Amino acid sequence: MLSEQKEIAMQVSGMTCAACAARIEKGLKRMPGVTDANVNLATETVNVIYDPAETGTAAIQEKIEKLGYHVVIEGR
Numbered sequence: 001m002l003s004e005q006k007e008i009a010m011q012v013s014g015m016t017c018a019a020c021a022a023r024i025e026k027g028l029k030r031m032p033g034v035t036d037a038n039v040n041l042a043t044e045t046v047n048v049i050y051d052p053a054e055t056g057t058a059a060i061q062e063k064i065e066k067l068g069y070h071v072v073i074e075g076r
């Protein structure tokens with residue numbers, strides 16, 4: 001038992017409104033390693049609270065597509 005938590009921050013694109021933006025994160029929470037998720041669309045950003053041993057980008061990118069969104073990584 002351990003499972004750390006970390007908070008990523010990333011950009012978003014390809015969206016209707018600051019509401020579907022919630023459902024992507026909230027749906028995304030339902031994957032493994034993820035525990036919370038919070039779209040900070042107030043400043044056009046998204047934050048995802050997950051375990052980066054169990055999750056990573058992988059499941060997130062997979063889901064992001066399926067949810068009908070795309071995120072952008074201007075930070076790396």
Ligand SMILES: [Cu+2]
Nearest residue numbers: 016017019020
């Ligand atoms: Cu919407």
